[model samples]
Target: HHHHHGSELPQMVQQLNSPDQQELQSALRKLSQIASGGNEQIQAVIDAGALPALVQLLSSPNEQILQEALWALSNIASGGNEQIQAVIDAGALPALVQLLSSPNEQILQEALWALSNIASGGNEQIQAVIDAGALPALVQLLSSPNEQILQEALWALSNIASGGNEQKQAVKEAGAEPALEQLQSSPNEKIQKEAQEALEKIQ
Candidate 1:
């Protein structure tokens, strides 16, 4: 019995567990819409108490649903302290870090892109994710051949490395140094150059 209103979200929360792809897809699209909606809708979903449902989807059996929901949550909460807090509240960081291994390159790219957004939201966000231990996975993405993903990852790394010694240390702990070393020689001259620039700041 879905809630006639705010409560309705809980029922759909179960949809994340659905074995059917179509069912999961349907749920994902809805979550995406909610996530991509105007700030009002984003807050409404959060205020309407949809956090648990979104969290439930993080562990969803359906990868599409999980990925979309993660993207939605990441995009939706950007720039809001409460929303960002909700993201960490939902236990998204670890699984989001794991999403790098997704077979779909688009998902893989978007996942990293979304992480860049979440982790870059603010100083607190940066520290929170670092505390949650996301830096290592982010550092691992540095070697990715996907130029776009690498670019966004670098941008995020730059932000994370901005704050202070702790942050710089965090970025390094994630293995960014090696990624920079490898990318310095990349044939993609522009990316190589940009990555080198970003890496220098942290060093």
Candidate 2:
């Protein structure tokens, strides 16, 4: 005869906020994984009226929570416009853009991945992120010291650049050209192939 299960997220957040470092770290890790997986249960957490709480947590002084919140927002944004709009309304895109400029590798990586997903949602969707100045930051990622970040940036770039003329133009104006020039002479076959394919599709 149970009335409610309470919220899995609140419990998880509480654990993450706990004084015990291990518990907090465990919760943070679990939350991060949940936010990365775009499955039904994870989606429920995002859809179950918990997004606002996640948004509030984005402002938490706890760096881990902030990171997890961005992860969740990015996951939610992958669902579509309403979920994406919620992220935009939560004052996140600016913070994400800032993080892209951060020296923090993890933060910049997540920011690019999130911003890239948002950019893939077509003109109106990408326009929101583009207007927020995500474009240049994305370009910067192409030259990042981390090879993983650079690869993710290319994947994201291709996705955003998938939409026809307007999106391609925005990517160009965002400074993808320099990266294209750099990639052209690369010995890496994958980057060269992707660069050529992206050029054919986007140009």
Candidate 3:
């Protein structure tokens, strides 16, 4: 039964398991909205089993479905510490790392968004991301023509490098320093400055 406090919760969570692609896509879009609402909504989403559900949709052939699932997961990851850990505990890191290879721009961007937030968390969470092998994928994104994608990818890599010696060494070994240095010529001065800052950490 759906809760009167949020009717969309149960229905969306239930439909995520639907065999129909359209149903899953629709549910994911609505679920993404709820997850991004605020702290309360993020908690409600976790309570409603959104973490696992979103993780399951990572491989959907429907690009929109995958994008919405990643978008929801990103917002959930951006929440309080418990919400961030909820996503990590739900086993999202490896799946999100895999998403870095997604051909769809939206999927890659949102997945990067989720990981950047995760990288901002404590040592364990950042280590989980490093352990999942996200550094190489993130380094590759520095060359993306889409400025938005490039920026988010840069941010994620930056956070990983900032997380500490092991994290910095991992991303550095993956070659993020050179990639970020190459990004120095970017027309966006912000990206240039950020690239400088990130490079300083690795250097």
In terms of TM-score, which candidate is strongest? Answer: 3
Worst 10 residues of 3 by lDDT: 1-10
* TM-score of decoy 2: 0.73
- What C-alpha lDDT does candidate 1 achieve relative to the native structure? 0.69
Residue 68 local lDDT, model 2? 69
Quote each prediction's TM-score: 0.76, 0.73, 0.86
Clashes of 2: 0
Per-residue CA lDDT of candidate 3, range 17-76, in tens?
998878878888877777767888889989987777788878777777777787888888
The runs of at least 3 residues in candidate 1 whose Cα sits more than 4 Å from the true structure, single-residue gaps closed, are: 1-24, 145-149
Residue pairs clashing, model 3 = none
Q: lDDT for each of the candidates?
A: 0.69, 0.68, 0.82
* Model 3 clash tally, residue pairs: 0
By the TM-score metric, which is better: model 1 or model 2? 1
RMSD of 1: 4.3
